[PDB]
Amino acid sequence: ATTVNGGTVHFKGEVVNAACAVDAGSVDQTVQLGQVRTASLAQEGATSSAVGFNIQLNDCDTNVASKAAVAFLGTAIDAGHTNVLALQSSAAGSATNVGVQILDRTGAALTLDGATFSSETTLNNGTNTIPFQARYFATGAATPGAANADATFKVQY
Amino acid sequence: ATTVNGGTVHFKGEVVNAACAVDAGSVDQTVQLGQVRTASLAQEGATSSAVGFNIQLNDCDTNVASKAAVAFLGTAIDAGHTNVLALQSSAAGSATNVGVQILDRTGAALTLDGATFSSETTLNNGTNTIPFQARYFATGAATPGAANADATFKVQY
Amino acid sequence: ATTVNGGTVHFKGEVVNAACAVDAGSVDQTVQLGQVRTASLAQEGATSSAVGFNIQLNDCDTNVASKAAVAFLGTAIDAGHTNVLALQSSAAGSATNVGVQILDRTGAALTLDGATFSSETTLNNGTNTIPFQARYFATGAATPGAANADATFKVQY
Amino acid sequence: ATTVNGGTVHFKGEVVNAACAVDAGSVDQTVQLGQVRTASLAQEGATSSAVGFNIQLNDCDTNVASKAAVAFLGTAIDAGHTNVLALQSSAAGSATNVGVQILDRTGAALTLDGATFSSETTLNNGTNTIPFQARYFATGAATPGAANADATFKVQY
Amino acid sequence: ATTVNGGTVHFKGEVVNAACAVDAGSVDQTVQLGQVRTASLAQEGATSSAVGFNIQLNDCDTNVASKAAVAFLGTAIDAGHTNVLALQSSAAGSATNVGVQILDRTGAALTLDGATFSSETTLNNGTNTIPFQARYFATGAATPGAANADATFKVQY
Amino acid sequence: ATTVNGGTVHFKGEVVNAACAVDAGSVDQTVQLGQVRTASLAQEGATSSAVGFNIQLNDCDTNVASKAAVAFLGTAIDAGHTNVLALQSSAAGSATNVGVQILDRTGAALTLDGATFSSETTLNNGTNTIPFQARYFATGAATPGAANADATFKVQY
């Protein structure tokens, strides 16, 4: 009695054929960076502190593959600096001459092409986790405003 | 001085005459499933792990009705299997011979007709929450690709 | 002062005498299919992935009728295959030996005659929504080009 | 080499001398009304729900004029009811004893004479938009069939 | 080799000459209201709970202007109640004798004329955000059905 | 009993013979730019912040082709500046001496001819995504008004 309709529910997923699958808690997330002062970013080559995140992998069989690495794809700020993201801004006066890198666990930047791969990682029989860091990078004088970036990634076995 | 026009803002809502109303945070949402390997879906009757969601109800008076149940409506993959969604794909080569079910809290699939109702649930004077789960189901051999589903629902008092 | 004429505005609507009326957002719409490769459509009986749409009904009284179904009317590609649309092309070299079906929620094709009706659907006191799917179908070898189809429909109480 | 003629292309436009000009996307458009049941239109004074549209104005200087209003011109169904359109039908048995009004943002009908003007509207330096609504109106008992209306308009500064 | 055409991409934007510009994430959005029971809207003067939204402003210089306020423009349900939206319905039997207001941060309704402005707001050198609320309002007895509204806005410096 | 006709439904799609097909969610879309102040666009060579979009590809086989790139086709504002769109305006006083570019992931403008191609991109076995950015560009002094652009594209394997 007194039946009423509801709303709508969507679904998102994938079916892949590889060694180890990507956890559902890491297909889309949001890492914060907080704020950073212009006095810490004065000249070219300036660098702030870094925060970290991770990529979780589940149902990981060692008998079909041994190691794993990743690769990233974004948008360079300049053809001279081929390792810094551009700014996925809101087209309403964001910051100028800034950018964010991606640091490997070995401690180096990555080439944003989708072909440069990172170092290897030995796996287990189950849950595996690979950490990464990110930090701001400047190519000169900094300006106040806003800053947002966005990128995708890709793994290899 | 210097007045400038803005943009446009829309509104969506309903007015219903029933016992307990649907929360605004659950008329439209998006639950992720992540990924799943083809090796876990080999033969007919294959089953992966399940994630969960919930439906929130507010302003719920016990004096006009006691219990509540739901029902779902989608699209079957086959007339033999009357409890599995089809794939609301992008018509660009998604996965084949897969599908997603809906598991009740009593632990059974539901008939996608909009007439089969679930078990009852005792209510409170205020916020009430009913949980559900979903998981992948196969009817044979699996293929790589993509997978998206979509369905609506309907309650009863 | 300084009065200037404007343009012209048209109106389209209907007045029907039935149980439940058709929403204004679904008397005329356009569903996309994107693209599809010829390698996925090789032999007779080939099938691609499917996208979905819906028909919305409003002001729906249960006291005058209980269930509802639909029927479609188009143009067959052949008298042997009485369930596939032809191609409402632009007469400038579109694709050959392709076509689009309509899948019911029970998971079957429909006979394009305007007399074959689909399965029933229980109604509410208000907004009701009935989903459907569509996908490409081939009767042999496929050719590149373009593809457009068009059809009408009809309901029953 | 191998030159072939094409087709024909037309042009439509105006040159006016006033404060603010009419956008090209609103000299001719088509607003739908969907359907409406005869049970909602039973006696004289019956009223259905309303949909809305808008008129867009561009290059609007405030220094030459301040406010603006509109006026409409159509065909009355009766000399007693001087605010309801007639039915621009197809002379093949459309609906009887129906009609459509035009509601101002202040919430009143308009006199279809081309001399009754609406309320004022303060302007900006650029894009301005004035909304309006329309709904069905009856003067007695309704009949099934079809319904189409058409009208023009005129502004004032 | 094997070059294939793509689709079509559009663009929307504005160029304004003022103090502080409107963020791209708020020129067009959609706020939900969920559902509301008829028992909470019984007599004239009835009121339900409220949800909130905000308007984001970027690249905001304090040296050219100090404060800011907004104004709204819609369609009144009645000339007696000059602060309640009408219902931008689908002309297929939506709800009757309902409506939605707009509450300022000072806690008052707004006059839907496009000339009544709200209270001031002190600005920063960059991102600024102004919140607002909305809730259902009734002028008598409520009916079941649907409810949709739509309005535009306009700022001042 | 009491059968009533419905409306009309259209279909749009393509059949192509290439390596990787275009997703249905990206044959036609609309990216917003919001607003931008005239003070940020003062002289020739002025530049605002950028927003981003992407092109999704599905059912992508690596065994028939390896890399992919795109090309664009629009309308230049001048024969001296062969990389800036014109303004697909409404012929009612839009902005003057503005325009929008397209930035590659390598960080350069593109020649609007339909023959200049972008950089390569390594592919996967399935879903692939290629990002791009867009921003306003000026060739002198800016004017207030409106701004809309439109372009098509084309891929290569």
Residue numbers in the entry:
A (entry chain F), B (entry chain E), C (entry chain B), D (entry chain A), E (entry chain D), F (entry chain C): 2 to 158
Q: What did the study's authors say about this model?
A:
Adhesive chaperone-usher pili are long, supramolecular protein fibers displayed on the surface of many bacterial pathogens. The type 1 and P pili of uropathogenic Escherichia coli (UPEC) play important roles during urinary tract colonization, mediating attachment to the bladder and kidney, respectively. FimA (type 1 pilus) and PapA (P pilus) assemble into a ∼1,000-subunit long helically coiled quaternary structure of ∼3–4 subunits per turn known as the rod (Habenstein et al., 2015, Hospenthal et al., 2017, Hospenthal et al., 2016). The biomechanical properties of the helical pilus rods allow them to reversibly uncoil in response to flow-induced forces, allowing UPEC to retain a foothold in the unique and hostile environment of the urinary tract.
Here we present the 4.2-Å resolution cryoelectron microscopy (cryo-EM) structure of the related type 1 pilus rod. Type 1 pili were expressed and assembled on the Escherichia coli cell surface, from which they were sheared and purified by density gradient centrifugation as described in STAR Methods. The resulting electron density map was resolved to an overall resolution of 4.2 Å, which is consistent with the map showing clearly separated strands and visible density for bulky side chains. The pilus rod is ∼72 Å in diameter and contains a hollow central lumen, which is ∼14 Å wide. Overall, the type 1 pilus is a right-handed superhelical assembly comprising 3.13 subunits per turn with an axial rise of 8.0 Å per subunit and a pitch of 25 Å. An extensive subunit-subunit interaction network maintains the integrity of the superhelical quaternary structure, where each subunit interacts with a total of eight other subunits, four preceding and four succeeding subunits (n interacts with +1, +2, +3, +4 and −1, −2, −3, −4). By far the largest contribution to the subunit-subunit interaction network is made by the main stacking interface between every n and n+3 subunit pair. The majority of this interface is formed by residues on the loops linking β strands C and D (βC-βD loop) and D and E (βD-βE loop). By contrast, the N-terminal portion of the FimA Nte lies flat against the remainder of the FimA pilin fold. In turn, this implies that the stacking interface is stronger in type 1 pili (Andersson et al., 2008, Andersson et al., 2007). These findings are indeed supported by our cryo-EM structure of the type 1 pilus rod, which has a larger buried surface area (1,616.2 Å2) in the n and n+3 (stacking) interface than the P pilus (1,453.0 Å2) (Hospenthal et al., 2016).
